[PDB]
Amino acid sequence: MKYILVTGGVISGVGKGVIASSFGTLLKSCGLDVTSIKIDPYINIDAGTFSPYEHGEVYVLDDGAEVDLDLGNYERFLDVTLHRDNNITTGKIYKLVIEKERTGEYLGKTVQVVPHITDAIQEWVERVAQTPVQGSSKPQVCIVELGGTIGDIEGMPFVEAFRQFQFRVKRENFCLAHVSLVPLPKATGEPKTKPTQSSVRELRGCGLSPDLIVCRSEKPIGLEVKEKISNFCHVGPDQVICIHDLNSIYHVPLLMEQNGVIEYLNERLQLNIDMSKRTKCLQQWRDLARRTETVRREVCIAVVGKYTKFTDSYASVVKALQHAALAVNRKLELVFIESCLLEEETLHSEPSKYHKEWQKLCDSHGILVPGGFGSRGMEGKIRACQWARENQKPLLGICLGLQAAVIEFARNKLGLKDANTTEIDPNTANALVIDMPEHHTGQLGGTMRLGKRITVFSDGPSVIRQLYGNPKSVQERHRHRYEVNPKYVHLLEEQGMRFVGTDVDKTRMEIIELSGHPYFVATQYHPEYLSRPLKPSPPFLGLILASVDRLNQYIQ
Amino acid sequence: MKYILVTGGVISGVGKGVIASSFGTLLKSCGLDVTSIKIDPYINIDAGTFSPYEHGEVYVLDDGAEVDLDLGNYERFLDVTLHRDNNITTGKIYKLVIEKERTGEYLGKTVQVVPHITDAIQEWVERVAQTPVQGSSKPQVCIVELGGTIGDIEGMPFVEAFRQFQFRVKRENFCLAHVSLVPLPKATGEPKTKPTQSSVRELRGCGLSPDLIVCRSEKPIGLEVKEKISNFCHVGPDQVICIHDLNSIYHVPLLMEQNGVIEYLNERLQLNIDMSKRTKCLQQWRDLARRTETVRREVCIAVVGKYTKFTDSYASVVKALQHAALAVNRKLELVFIESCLLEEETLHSEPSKYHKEWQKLCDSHGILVPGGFGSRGMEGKIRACQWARENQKPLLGICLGLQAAVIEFARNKLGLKDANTTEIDPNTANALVIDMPEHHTGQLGGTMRLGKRITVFSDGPSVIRQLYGNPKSVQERHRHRYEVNPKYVHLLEEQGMRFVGTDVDKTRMEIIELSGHPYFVATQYHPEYLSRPLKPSPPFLGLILASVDRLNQYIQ
Amino acid sequence: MKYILVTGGVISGVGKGVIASSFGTLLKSCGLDVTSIKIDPYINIDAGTFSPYEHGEVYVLDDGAEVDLDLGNYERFLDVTLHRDNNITTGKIYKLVIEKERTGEYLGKTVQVVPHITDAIQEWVERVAQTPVQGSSKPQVCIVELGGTIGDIEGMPFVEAFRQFQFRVKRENFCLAHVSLVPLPKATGEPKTKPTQSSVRELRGCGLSPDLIVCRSEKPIGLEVKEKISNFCHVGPDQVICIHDLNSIYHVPLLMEQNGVIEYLNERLQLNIDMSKRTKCLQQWRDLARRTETVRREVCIAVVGKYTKFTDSYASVVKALQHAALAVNRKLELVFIESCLLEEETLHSEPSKYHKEWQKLCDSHGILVPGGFGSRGMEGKIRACQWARENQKPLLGICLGLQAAVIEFARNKLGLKDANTTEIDPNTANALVIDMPEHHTGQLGGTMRLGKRITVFSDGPSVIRQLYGNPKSVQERHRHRYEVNPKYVHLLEEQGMRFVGTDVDKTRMEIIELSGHPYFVATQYHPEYLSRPLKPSPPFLGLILASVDRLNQYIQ
């Protein structure tokens, strides 16, 4: 196997994820089978106990693992289905080693960071890079992305491990790409290279020497800075890639190919890539990158969320909307409406903000009510669901907009002003949402309905089933404990509601619809985790279509 | 509280243990209440899975913990009874933090080395330095000893933690002593200071600056090197302590007091030590250090062990023998006889070594058969027990020489040539030694009879009970699974054997004796873990006495 | 060209000089043409302003330069005649660069350490390694020896320069050998490898990775430590050379050849060394190393010097005596008599030391009065010259024992009790030694008679001319200002004195002799700088011969 470690320099948040995914899609278009690994140096087995403000929209994999979002970038660019062992952390490693020790598999000897922790890291990487990730095909390249910045005390074990790995795997089977920042202050008005110099120096002071140096700047830099970097880093003048701020991220693979990275790698790792046939493989990505510039229609969508102060806490949602729009040939424009500012409590505090946010919500072509955990800001979601039900405005809810929509329907058509979940107020008289742990009721192994599960379609013509291709069932990724109450099923179904999707046991409804409303679908699963750039999720696709008044035409 | 971190420099194995214990005994003679902590940067909860070749004679504490031997130095110098939390490791810390994370006590946030691991280390140190360790008195000084060498990747978390600790605890309550090596090669014939320079530079490059620099050399160095160190380390000329290779280790506290370390600390940590009364407190240690030079009697003892290639795998045993000798006013001389070279299998290989070792064993005044685990080299222990029983030679066995002695008695007085343990050969017909797990039979919590337990004395005049002060019972530290068979009790007691000590349940014999033999005591417990310099263990004391033919006189 | 940088580790004074000279003589026996370079990181153009206590017996080259003594090791092992540019210092480099700047050869640009100082160092090394040093043959290998220890602030420019040099010269033309110390303390009784680990880590943290690791210890270390070093340094198990303390230094090249360093280098630098013919080239060195063990005759020589507290301040003298002895097949034994302890001023202070030193001087077979500068301890030299003239004891004086001998002859045969030099007391009435600057009288360029000059032989049968091969003249290296007075020439020649050697101008006498004395030669030049192991200097040879009463036989 051949490995490509990707490291970071001046700051964290400079683009290693897209760089790595681009290497991956390049190598995958040239006929290879790539896999990927993300190394988070934080002491956390997984991202289940995380808040979106911390690390941006916890992802979910098919086996039920909750991981970083960079694995989402990998899955969306390479079109693969990773596993849990593709997300290494310091906690996983130390816990594995400590268990091994207490058991007695290090019999009699002293366990130290070097060599035992680093051997664990190496064995992990080697074992994981051989797990068939796109069926049964065995990988040939593995892209490791070392989160953080080179120099921190958190990621020294890993740097040492890879310092030994390059000797262990015959450097002709190992490359290292360093992503650094070239700041261009507004005072000096000149790009500065000293940060990159210090970062490369710190790196080489750890036993590693870069082969590529991808310099991330806001605006393009000239050959002067390129040759300065080449000199002060002993890299050539053609293996210093310059990646400025592009329109979209489908430009990055192209900006890398045009800079001769495919040829460099084919010559450096000895991959045996037939050049004459590696033409016209990125055609799909060129088309997609052109459609990113050749769309002027201005479809506007409303994201009624509670973390809207961050734009990374909805990464997969935003990106699925973008994919669907690009497939509909429209220019998406997203307004981030905070659900806290739709309640009357802010009307008593800042009527200005209240009316401004409600105006935003009212002059939009569609409404998306994402998921979330807790209680802060759910009443606003219910207000928005109601307003979109009383104004014939399309709406899509995801695992919490479904609960909110059902609550709205209850408290506004059954008059049950006490309708609520068992989460916001447990001692409520009427409870439309109650816990249904998958199997935690009985054991501790399996509390939350995590991972990919089956959902069959109840009989009845439904637009959501038509969008999905009129199948019998779908596999989708779930992350939720609660569920719609099975007793109020008829109390709310003898009305403008319809449950078209459920599990094989018919006790869990996870796809609802409204009668007469043009588009009021809501799902208990997360359809955004299976939305690839060349494959938009049917729900978001229908949302966009109905939001521009083209859905019925698209069906017929 | 006031803390004294002790760090190491050029190499590991330069004397930090004795330096720290000496600081402790100095401060404890001046009227203070000291506690101690040892920081082993290895990934091991404890030293239960260790072999003596690794880290030198696993110690045992009253609560059942198996720790390093440096805690033995602390206990023997300060006369305290430490606990399990007085031995910090990287594994303990990381495991605690990982459990906290998985539970949810770091709610929502990202756990990193800094600040979380270092905060755990700080809280651990602060909580532990306040645990009454000599009764109910609360400590006032805590001596932390950071194992390893400053610069290694294993102990960076701890160095960072203490870099923050010195600010957290108001540097007037914090000192740092650096122990370094001054090599004197035989080519240059001149002491070299460059290693110490590099070590102090690496240290200061971590945020810490030494207050004392204890330079360990083989021979005394002059004022030239002292002032060179003072210059190149920005320490004064009086806070550079020079500690050469002394006769014994009871000289180190004196060589430190004479160098004005007590005054320096009293002025630096502001301890309020009344100088006029701090005279004639180390009188006991001066007497002991003089008795180390004024003894010429040449009592020779045989240590029939299996790890005799190392002199640190019997540290506590050797030191208890030294204490007892010094109390008897004799100059101990130890011969380390490997038990493997007493079997006939080496007679068929190297008769020279066989006869040499047997000669050594035969021209000695006494025999000590220490403990150990496994099977390699036990037959030799049985041969030695027999020879000492058939030649009226004193013998003392410790938790494995007792089993070996019982096996010898069986197979040489009952003719049961098949007598053996259930460990060497489980399917044996006759088994004199069988497992009796304390409570593992029933659960997993408590398999080995670890820690301090009670042993009552069965009726009958016994020399071992006379040595112990004629008490009803004794508290001693046990570490063993096996036990003498309760069915062969009479098969071997209707002979020259006598079981004078047992537990409160009378099902476990742990003190035996021979009838007619001058001294053939053997104990299932470890009496060397309670042998302090000013308090020798009664068993070793009686061994030495009988070995010089003075025991009967000492009793009467 | 192919370069071999030699670096040092734990301490300075571990043996890089002999290591490098051994590499040189190995490569030179295999048919190559080696040159050498010494990099002293001190700010000193040369060693003219130095005292022997500082850096051990300032050397002198043919062109008049005063350099370190390591160039003496190079000259004595490779049999070459180096130049001034073969001794790089920080001062030379910075001065060259500053002159270039002030002139304007760096026109308009900013001069910095990197890249300008390092480019100066590289250009210097490349230019110097191509200067024919053994005639007109152009070198093929250049051995650079970087004085100091890797890590110090003095030698970072050079380490950076060579980090760039390995890329500039195509690593197949560059090797780096790291000499480190493996301390074996007497407490632990075990070799420690952690210093070497830290040194290799610091090195790799500067951009360089060792190819060989020569470990210098006092006693041989086993394969365990070798493999530990190989592991913790990523070098093989055969490129870790172990060099213990040998009898002599003619063993080092052999101990290196036997360890397969010649083959390693031939394979690593691609030198094209014909193995089948590289046998029986070190035969001379094997013979010399055997003669170092097979000599038992105990010739004793007296070194009447003033720096005798150091054994490196007479390196060349001691080594020339050793060469001559080995050629005479005798075991040299050197007694270092301090000339200060022969004056009556110590008789009034410590008669014990006075009589002890005079006894030492009296029970020796010969006397050597070396050179030196100043006044402290010259009266003792005159006392010794007299005693050796009045007791028929051989004597050899070198550029200061000649002045002392002439002073003795004057004040003890002419009664001129005021005889003295113009240096000890300038206003003296009688002055036997006066300044005769070569050409400083007239200019500032050439004050001291430095460098190699001609000395012709005045007519008359002389034993010193017979030893030199009965030539007409000799080329020898001078370093001195003063000279014998040309007016007292006859005042002291109409007596037991004879001036057999002088310059072409017949105004400077530099070879004297006594009439009737068996051997009382004294030279104003330094004959020890041309004494190679296989070519002993005639003066020392005759001294040894006459000291064993074999000189007349050797002549006839």
Ligand SMILES: Nc1ncnc2c1ncn2[C@@H]1O[C@H](COP(=O)(O)OP(=O)(O)CP(=O)(O)O)[C@@H](O)[C@H]1O
């Ligand atoms: N060259 C580029 N041009 C335009 N947009 C870019 C870009 N590189 C990154 N981006 C955008 O900024 C975001 C930066 O996040 P990214 O994950 O790529 O870097 P990162 O440093 O946060 C990875 P990690 O968190 O593991 O350190 C990307 O998601 C992308 O939307």
Ligand SMILES: Nc1ncnc2c1ncn2[C@@H]1O[C@H](COP(=O)(O)OP(=O)(O)CP(=O)(O)O)[C@@H](O)[C@H]1O
């Ligand atoms: N100044 C001294 N003089 C004489 N003997 C000394 C000595 N210092 C230490 N020793 C002896 O050498 C042994 C060195 O072991 P010690 O535990 O003191 O250092 P160390 O570096 O091994 C602690 P750690 O293992 O935690 O790093 C001591 O047990 C002692 O018997």
Ligand SMILES: Nc1ncnc2c1ncn2[C@@H]1O[C@H](COP(=O)(O)OP(=O)(O)CP(=O)(O)O)[C@@H](O)[C@H]1O
């Ligand atoms: N392996 C060896 N065996 C025996 N003697 C040795 C030896 N290596 C060195 N020596 C002796 O010790 C002396 C050490 O001086 P040397 O010049 O070789 O090291 P060094 O570190 O002082 C060079 P520099 O001053 O440039 O750093 C040598 O001159 C030699 O006489």
Ligand SMILES: O=c1ccn([C@@H]2O[C@H](COP(=O)(O)OP(=O)(O)OP(=O)(O)O)[C@@H](O)[C@H]2O)c(=O)[nH]1
């Ligand atoms: O104020 C200064 C700045 C710099 N210098 C010295 O002149 C040199 C200028 O180097 P700089 O630090 O100004 O920039 P750089 O060329 O290393 O890379 P960029 O940040 O421009 O991308 C440096 O080597 C420094 O030693 C000064 O003497 N004074």
Ligand SMILES: O=c1ccn([C@@H]2O[C@H](COP(=O)(O)OP(=O)(O)OP(=O)(O)O)[C@@H](O)[C@H]2O)c(=O)[nH]1
């Ligand atoms: O061979 C050498 C050795 C040393 N030096 C230079 O002269 C200085 C001598 O310093 P040293 O390295 O010889 O020793 P030290 O005084 O630092 O401490 P000790 O090991 O003696 O205890 C150093 O600063 C070095 O730069 C040389 O130029 N050449």
Ligand SMILES: O=c1ccn([C@@H]2O[C@H](COP(=O)(O)OP(=O)(O)OP(=O)(O)O)[C@@H](O)[C@H]2O)c(=O)[nH]1
């Ligand atoms: O007192 C100690 C000493 C060492 N250690 C830990 O156990 C390991 C022992 O490693 P050492 O530091 O004792 O020696 P070494 O094997 O690195 O090389 P030598 O000096 O023996 O030649 C080290 O990695 C350290 O983390 C401790 O925990 N406590």
Ligand SMILES: NC(=O)CC[C@H](N)C(=O)O
């Ligand atoms: N992902 C979410 O929005 C979670 C919503 C809610 N906690 C549930 O389990 O249904």
Ligand SMILES: NC(=O)CC[C@H](N)C(=O)O
């Ligand atoms: N400490 C020891 O010598 C152990 C001996 C034996 N394993 C027992 O448990 O009795």
Ligand SMILES: NC(=O)CC[C@H](N)C(=O)O
């Ligand atoms: N090298 C020396 O001994 C110098 C001696 C004296 N200074 C001279 O010039 O003659």
